[PDB]
């Protein structure tokens, strides 16, 4: 009944099949031994196919059957707390996963008329970017830098910051999390899974992984299945956050699979259409309108660069595609700034409507003296001859740049961030040794959680500060300043 073909070629994970006149493009095919294939290049003589799974089990006498199906994946709601390969099978021995629906991987993105503006905060634990470059629901942000700078740490901190939000039963604040690991070492996957498990956040997140051993082409289509998993929840008025561990390896895999068959090569032997792939992948995230339900998806891609060459092909394409950028410099990382993020060039193009009004007030003041300290750093040698205003600006910039750095695996609450930034920008850091600046505030913060926690509740309820709040804070500051002892002598105002 069904059309059956043969095999004519085999090598480097490529097979040519003669037959199947009725075959459609990108139709999954079956090979003896339970081998999966994908049709990717049609022709009147024969059709090419990339091999999924086993390779050395292919010869010239095999028979081929067509599944009559294009591409799909079980997208049920039982994937939370499970590790799954890109195809859909569970890697662990916990057992299979109950599923409810099957959806394709080539659905159209929401149209222009279905869009909506963005105004939600989408808070994170890193105070280095919340006050500098706000991130909102349905908005695309990119992180760029060199190897061993610490980007995965920022990713996992953002992932695990949502514990308090998940604690409440409100479906209008719960956020689901999807992690995609591409072409990595399995031990690293185990380590990050263990870190998440000991953080307690494994109960509301999912992981899809494709280690470096996947020569079958699984590295080609992991983000597709991740986005397909996310979209089912995103069409139900629920908020999802998706992280891609890397994308350069995806491009390399696509280039290799194209070069293996006949494809005209452009720059750097890259195939004909690379920009289209990333564009159509990264245009799925969007804040739906109120009529559709109100669900949202926020994506986070990652790109690795060599020798800070931001003028290459892939980095240029991704920078053009994306909506916001953040930069990490290994020089800053070696300098001693743990959040190596460079405030000089990283810019988010949203209007700042995502964040809350108090931090909106304080960020404007922060920008000015940050720029002043950045420009006036050369006069450190002759600081005696400078003017009093210049000295004050230099000292304020020094204290500020000392304030921002934080240790990893320590997310910060929004009330705590607001209080810390307000304390920094109001001149209360004067007459304090710079090193103890890192210590002192933390201890002070703890005291606020002990006897005066009502301020955090007021900030939660009102999303702003009142005169009574600020006078209570200044009174508490004056109380605690005398109690704290400096590491070198003591001094208070």
């Amino acid at each position: 009944r069904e059309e059956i073909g043969t095999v004519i070629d085999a090598g480097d994970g490529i097979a040519h099949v003669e037959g199947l006149p009725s075959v459609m493009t990108q139709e999954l095919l079956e090979f003896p031994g339970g081998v999966l294939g994908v049709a990717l290049n049609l022709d009147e003589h024969s059709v090419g196919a990339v091999i999924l799974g086993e390779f050395e089990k292919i010869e010239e006498g095999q028979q081929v059957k067509r599944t009559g199906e294009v591409l799909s994946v079980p997208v049920g709601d039982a994937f939370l707390g499970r590790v799954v390969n890109p195809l859909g099978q569970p890697i662990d021995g916990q057992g299979d996963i109950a599923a409810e629906t099957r959806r394709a991987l080539e659905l159209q993105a929401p149209s222009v008329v279905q869009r909506q503006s963005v105004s939600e905060p989408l808070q994170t634990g890193i105070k280095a970017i919340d006050a500098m470059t706000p991130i909102g629901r349905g908005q695309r942000q990119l992180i760029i830098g060199d190897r061993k700078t610490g980007k995965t740490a920022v990713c996992v901190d953002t992932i695990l910051n949502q514990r308090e939000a998940w604690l409440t039963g409100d479906p209008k604040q719960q956020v689901r999390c999807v992690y995609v690991a591409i072409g990595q070492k399995g031990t690293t996957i185990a380590s990050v899974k263990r870190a998440l498990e000991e953080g307690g956040a494994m109960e509301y997140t999912t992981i899809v992984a494709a280690p470096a051993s996947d020569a079958a082409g699984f590295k080609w289509l992991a983000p597709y299945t991740g986005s397909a998993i996310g979209q089912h929840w995103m069409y139900n008025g629920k908020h999802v956050l998706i992280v891609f561990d890397d994308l350069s390896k995806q491009a390399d895999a696509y280039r290799a699979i194209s070069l293996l068959l006949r494809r005209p090569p452009g720059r750097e032997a890259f195939p004909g259409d690379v920009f289209y792939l990333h564009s159509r992948l990264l245009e799925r995230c969007a804040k739906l309108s109120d009529e559709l339900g109100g669900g949202s998806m926020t994506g986070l891609p990652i790109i690795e660069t060599k020798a800070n060459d931001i003028s290459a092909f892939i980095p240029t394409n991704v920078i053009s595609i994306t909506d916001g950028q953040c930069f990490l410099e290994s020089d800053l990382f070696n300098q001693g700034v743990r959040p190596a993020i460079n405030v000089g060039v990283s810019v988010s193009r949203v209007g700042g409507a995502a964040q809350i009004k108090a931090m909106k007030e304080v960020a404007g003041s922060l920008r000015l003296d940050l720029s002043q300290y950045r420009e006036l750093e050369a006069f450190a040698a002759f600081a005696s001859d400078l003017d009093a205003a210049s000295k004050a600006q230099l000292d304020r910039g020094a204290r500020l740049v000392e304030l921002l750095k934080q240790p990893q695996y320590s997310p910060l609450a929004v009330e705590e961030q607001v209080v810390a930034i307000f304390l920094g920008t109001q001149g209360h850091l004067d007459s304090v040794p710079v090193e103890d600046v890192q210590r002192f505030e933390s201890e002070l913060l703890e005291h606020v959680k002990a006897s005066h926690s009502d301020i955090f509740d007021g900030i939660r309820e009102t999303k702003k500060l009142s005169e009574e709040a600020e006078e209570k804070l200044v009174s508490v500051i004056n109380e605690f300043k005398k109690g704290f002892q400096a590491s070198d002598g003591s001094s208070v105002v």
């Binding site: 070629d9 070492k185 996957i189 470096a212 070069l259």
Partner: protein, 464 residues
């Protein structure tokens, strides 16, 4: 059922078979050379399936003298090597033939060489510590038991002497077994290493296998698989801690490159094969050690043209942890350990895991070195007087730091004429803390050159 050869061109050969008798992939075939001057038995490995029942195969030994129409015999299975604990103490060929004595151990058990890597469930992170007795390694890039270690650098930097020093430092007094492999190395080094091992009492518990540069490309991409097969057998059956040593793994990649052109594959950006990452990933995954068993693997890699942006080293960086890097400037300025402190790091270092004093000392010294570098970039032209007191203090402290960071070595004592030594970890951390404090500013930098420990510092300083 024999088939026949149709084309011969360099290392690659083309064979045809009767219909129905086509061999599977990765099999082995035998061919005969009848010329009197050079008689051999060629072993062919099939690598490409083609139409009309033709196969492209690679050769294992040089193909001079072969003609057309010669029949070929099929083995029906992949190449296999002897296994067991009865192989250690002998030097073996790439195919397993004993160089010391032919026809030895041919009755041993022999099994497959190509296998799948283990499953993800059995994987487990491994965090530990092991002492080395070297100033740089114990401070900046601590090692780990059961992990992977690699040494990076360009040509003519001193990789081999470091490998010999490391085997002398670690392989001695080790409870378990050690396996060493040689890929594309100088034959003189192989001979003198064999002699040195025979000098001591460890050759009785070591298995050596290696192929040289003079061999055709067929051999240069197969010996590592044999070494991994031996190590896998020892780990799985007997179950003890094992050490693995590999030299210049980069040659393996080169072995593919030429054949990539002969097989018809299109070239990549720098003329590389399009599918290097997959093969290297398969190898590195095969390297792994599951929980309940330990494998300590150390490798050296060669940087081509002293360029770090080459496509090949990126994958090496990806599949690694706790690496070291060798540069050329420090070698030019006469520092024997060519490690660059500003471009090497390790994952295991952690205030929770290792400690807080170690971490603070490392951070302080690396910051000081960075400051010295970007200060020297200007002081080289504008002169010393252009800076303030703090800058000059930092420059002097940094100069003393890089002077003191060198050490004398075991295997290199003949060049220096004086035997080296080893130092404890606590002494190193205390001495470096004292150096960061700024107490040794009263001594000349010449006392810090090629020193070991602190008593030697005192003796050398009093010698002037």
């Amino acid at each position: 059922t024999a088939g026949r050869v149709v084309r011969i061109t360099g290392p690659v050969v083309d064979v045809e078979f009767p219909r129905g008798s086509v061999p599977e992939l990765f099999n082995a075939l035998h061919a005969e050379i009848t010329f009197g001057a050079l008689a051999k038995t060629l072993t062919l490995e099939v690598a490409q399936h083609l139409g009309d029942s033709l196969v492209r195969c690679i050769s294992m030994q040089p193909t001079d003298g072969l003609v057309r129409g010669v029949e070929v015999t099929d083995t029906g299975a992949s190449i296999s090597v002897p296994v067991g604990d009865g192989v250690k103490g002998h030097v073996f060929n790439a195919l397993g033939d004993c160089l010391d004595d032919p026809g030895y151990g041919k009755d041993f058990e022999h099994w497959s060489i190509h296998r799948k890597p283990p499953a993800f469930s059995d994987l487990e992170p491994r965090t530990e510590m092991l002492e080395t007795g070297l100033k740089v390694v114990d401070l900046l890039t601590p090692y780990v038991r059961g992990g992977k270690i690699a040494l990076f650098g360009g040509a003519g930097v001193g990789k081999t002497v470091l490998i010999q020093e490391m085997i002398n430092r670690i392989a001695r007094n080790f409870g378990g077994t050690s396996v060493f492999a040689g890929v594309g190395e100088r034959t003189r080094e192989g001979n003198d290493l064999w002699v040195e091992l025979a000098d001591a009492n460890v050759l009785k518990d070591t298995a050596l296998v290696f192929g040289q540069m003079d061999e055709p490309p067929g051999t240069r991409m197969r010996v590592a698989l044999s070494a991994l097969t031996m190590a896998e057998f020892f780990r799985d059956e007997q179950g003890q801690d094992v050490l693995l040593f590999i030299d210049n793994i980069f040659r393996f990649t080169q072995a593919g490159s030429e054949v990539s052109t002969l097989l018809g594959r299109m070239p990549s950006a720098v003329g590389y094969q399009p599918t290097l990452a997959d093969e290297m990933g398969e190898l590195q995954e095969r390297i792994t050690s599951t929980r309940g068993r330990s494998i300590t693997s150390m490798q050296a890699v060669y940087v081509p043209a002293d360029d770090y942006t080459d496509p090949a080293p990126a994958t090496t960086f990806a599949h690694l942890d706790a690496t070291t890097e060798l540069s050329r400037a420090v070698f030019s300025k006469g520092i024997f350990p060519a490690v660059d402190p500003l471009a090497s790091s390790s994952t295991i270092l952690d205030p929770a895991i290792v400690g807080d004093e170690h971490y603070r000392v490392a951070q302080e010294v690396i910051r000081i070195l960075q400051r010295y570098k970007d200060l020297q970039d200007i002081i080289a032209i504008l002169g010393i007087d252009e800076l303030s007191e703090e800058d000059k203090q930092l420059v002097n402290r940094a100069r003393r730091i890089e002077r003191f960071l060198s050490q004398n070595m075991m295997a290199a004592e003949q060049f220096t004429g004086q035997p080296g030594s080893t130092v404890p970890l606590k002494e190193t951390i205390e001495a470096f803390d004292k150096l960061t404090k700024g107490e040794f500013d009263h001594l000349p930098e010449q006392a810090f050159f090629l020193i070991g420990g602190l008593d030697d510092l005192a003796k050398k300083a009093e010698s002037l």
